[PDB]
Design a protein around this ligand. Structure first.
Ligand SMILES: CCS(O)(O)Nc1ccc2c(c1)-c1cn(C)c(=O)cc1OCCCCc1cc(F)cc(F)c1O2
Length: 109
């Protein structure tokens, strides 16, 4: 059932927030602060922004029908990072390391 699927999704996000992955997961914790980072072109490039706190809030509010909808927002968060930032940038390599953790956990359910 989708009820048991969403419970596993809470567990995946819990690992993503844990101190174990904190070294590369921290730039995805809260929404991208465009004013603090000085990213003048971020809103023009990224139409649908996403972060781990928004996914955590949408999960508690039962905004996802199934595990696929949760995975769609998690992948949107990574896809936005790959689209905006340069390929050689630090945050892109951090996104790949966090996605390695997500893809492995998301597949094993
Ligand atoms: C917690 C959300 S925040 O409050 O906005 N903090 C926050 C801090 C640093 C960030 C990001 C966000 C960030 C994240 N993501 C996913 C993006 O697509 C774009 C970003 O900014 C790019 C410009 C800064 C360059 C940067 C340089 C480094 F050496 C490490 C990074 F992690 C960097 O990136």
């Amino acid at each position: 059932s989708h009820m048991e699927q969403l419970k596993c999704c809470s567990g995946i996000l819990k690992e993503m927030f844990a101190k174990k992955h904190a070294a590369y997961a921290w730039p995805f914790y809260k929404p991208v602060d465009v004013e603090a980072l000085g990213l003048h072109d971020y809103c023009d490039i990224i139409k649908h922004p996403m972060d781990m706190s928004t996914i955590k809030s949408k999960l508690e509010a039962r905004e996802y029908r199934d595990a696929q909808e949760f995975g769609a927002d998690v992948r949107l968060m990574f896809s936005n990072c790959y689209k905006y930032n340069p390929p050689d940038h630090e945050v892109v390599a951090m996104a790949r390391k966090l996605q390695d953790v997500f893809e492995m956990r998301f597949a094993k359910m």
